């Protein structure tokens, strides 16, 4: 606690007391510079004390309002923080099936149920336009989730069963773009 006028007062008191003890003065003069220097400490300790109290009070007020702001701003944004965390984790995993279906979905191919695991249990998929059909459904086979599937039925957006060979690049505009494929597990 230096930036005090009481600091100047107390320092002058110390300097004068040092002069009194170094000049070889009499007995009562040092009592004036001891009673005044000790009243000086009884005021300087006090003002430095109260100022450090107010300082630490403001400091804990600061830490409290900081805690509050942090907590509330985080509670605001869970619905997005969770999603970004999930996807960085998924990308760090690096498996073939996961990435296969994530890329199919970012293109437009999404399932319509839970991907089953047994060799029975059907599986339905939405195909957006026919290019991905070229990159995927080749003949009676179907590759999804890095596993093999047998196509068993196709249909476009207006619920029309669509024959297999019926589809091609030429006849492509003759079908509703969102085709639907119903396959089984190999």
């Amino acid at each position: 606690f230096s930036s005090l006028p009481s600091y100047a007062a107390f320092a002058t008191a110390q300097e004068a007391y040092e002069q009194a003890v170094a000049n070889g003065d009499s007995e009562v003069v040092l009592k004036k510079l001891k009673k005044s220097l000790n009243v000086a400490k009884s005021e300087f300790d006090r003002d430095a004390a109260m100022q450090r109290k107010l300082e630490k009070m403001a400091d804990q007020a600061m830490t409290q309002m900081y805690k509050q702001a942090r907590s509330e701003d985080k509670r605001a944004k869970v619905t997005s923080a969770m999603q970004t965390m999930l996807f960085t984790m998924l990308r760090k995993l690096d498996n073939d099936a996961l990435n296969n279906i994530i890329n199919n979905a970012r293109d437009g191919c999404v399932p319509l149920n839970i991907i089953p695991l047994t060799t029975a249990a059907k599986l339905m998929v939405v195909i957006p336009d026919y290019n991905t059909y070229k990159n995927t459904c080749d003949g009676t086979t179907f590759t999804y989730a890095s596993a093999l599937w047998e196509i068993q039925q196709v249909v476009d957006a207006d619920s029309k069963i669509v024959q297999l060979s019926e589809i091609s690049m030429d006849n492509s505009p003759n079908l509703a773009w969102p085709l639907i494929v119903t396959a089984l597990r190999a």
Binding site: T79, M82, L93, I102, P111
Partner: protein, 72 residues
């Protein structure tokens, strides 16, 4: 490594539940089943196939626009 699978499965179930999926009933039962099965698995492969089967749920809906976060 397997711990990473368990951990991401926890996070995925949390996301699903906060997307109101528990409103529907049988679907939430299946999701809880797969999550609790993954948490107790011992080998990595079957845990991975349960993981993909369970992620298929989140993919089957249009609440999360993956084409945004898949920007790296």
């Amino acid at each position: 490594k397997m711990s990473d699978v368990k951990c991401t499965s926890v996070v995925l179930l949390s996301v699903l539940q906060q997307l109101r999926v528990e409103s529907s009933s049988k679907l939430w039962a299946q999701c809880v089943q797969l999550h609790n099965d993954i948490l107790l698995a011992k080998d990595t492969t079957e845990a991975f196939e349960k993981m993909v089967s369970l992620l298929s749920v989140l993919l089957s809906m249009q609440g999360a626009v993956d084409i945004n976060k898949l920007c790296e």
